[PDB]
Design a protein around this ligand. Sequence first.
Ligand SMILES: O=C(O)c1cccc(O)c1
Ligand SMILES: O=C(O)c1cccc(O)c1
Lengths: 213, 213
Amino acid sequence: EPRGVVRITCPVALLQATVSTMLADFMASCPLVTIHLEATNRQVDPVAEAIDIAIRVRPPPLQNSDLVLRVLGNRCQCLVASPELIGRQGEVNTPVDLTGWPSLGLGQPQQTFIWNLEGPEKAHAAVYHQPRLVTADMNTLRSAALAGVGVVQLPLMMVTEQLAEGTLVRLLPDWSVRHEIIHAVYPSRRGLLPSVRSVLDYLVQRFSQLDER
Amino acid sequence: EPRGVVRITCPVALLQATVSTMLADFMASCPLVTIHLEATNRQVDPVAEAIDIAIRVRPPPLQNSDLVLRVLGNRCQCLVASPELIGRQGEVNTPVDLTGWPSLGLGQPQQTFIWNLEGPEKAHAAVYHQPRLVTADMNTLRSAALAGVGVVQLPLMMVTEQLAEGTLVRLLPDWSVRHEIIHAVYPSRRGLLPSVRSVLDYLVQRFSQLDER
Ligand SMILES: O=C(O)c1cccc(O)c1
Ligand SMILES: O=C(O)c1cccc(O)c1
């Protein structure tokens, strides 16, 4: 019954870990729907590039633009390093202790990398680091952290198996990094289209069925 | 001993499946080397953007540009679909039989998607398809193919576990799609730098230790 083309954008790590299997199951149940899916980590302007659904992962506050916003879930972040690296660099009891640790950075080389932390008694700390590895691929960062290259901040869901095995260890567990909000942004008119709506509703139902943090 | 910044580009699927663990191990053994790694599937111009090492995956023939070329390995491709999809769409004994099958496409939406095939007795076939799913992420394509959304062409190394389980099946096994060559392209002067060379040599040794096809 739903038929037409739907143009979607989604960050890479979220697509591989979560969104891909949703879209696969949707397309199996809606044979007449065509999906053009750009896997990119760039900020996408939905109105100009005529994007029907743009999935984003950003920390609050979020864009109060003219676009419609639907929240899909919250994902917490954490600072991790390997036991080997911890054995060499000392103890981390306050954010100041991270100064000088080798680090890894998610993004582009020209960016300024800073860990924003909130701790007990409403304490805030902002720790600048010069990472020796900079990339947008979360898989590569996790493998580098596993080898003890540097401390890195990753989404919890990306490292759950490693932390359970002990091959990665959480630093400063009493402090917390700002959480990220998985949300979908769409132009008001595009969501009216029947095919776009069916895709939108199915994602909402699938994300509601998840109990990830 | 090696120290400095090395700027590298690498396609996503190859980075996640292969190149990431190499760079991780290298950086653990060379603490003074900084790596800026862009994970992108775009054609990178190394000379203009001042890229030290650009890793590419393209079928032969390759660029005879002024850049230095080092071959790292050959990766064969194959056409796969799920048993369920095969049960619904009929039998595939010649490339003509693929006409009309729902398909998936690796790339951008505006591209023209054609399967180039070579068969027995030096027979060539070129099968145009209109894919209902278009993306650059290989993981998403594999999950869609697993759900029976469409026939897709993927690198063999990406589907070895699926084919062994039977959840994906190889179409037209007597025909072959052109193979892809993993190679690294670098400006002649940039490779002279000590840090770039150490990275280059380590990749050459690591890829030589692989016996992937
Ligand atoms: O929960 C996830 O799988 C996830 C994936 C990517 C980014 C992110 O913040 C969260
Ligand atoms: O052999 C691989 O892992 C590979 C990964 C990506 C592309 C490709 O042609 C091959």
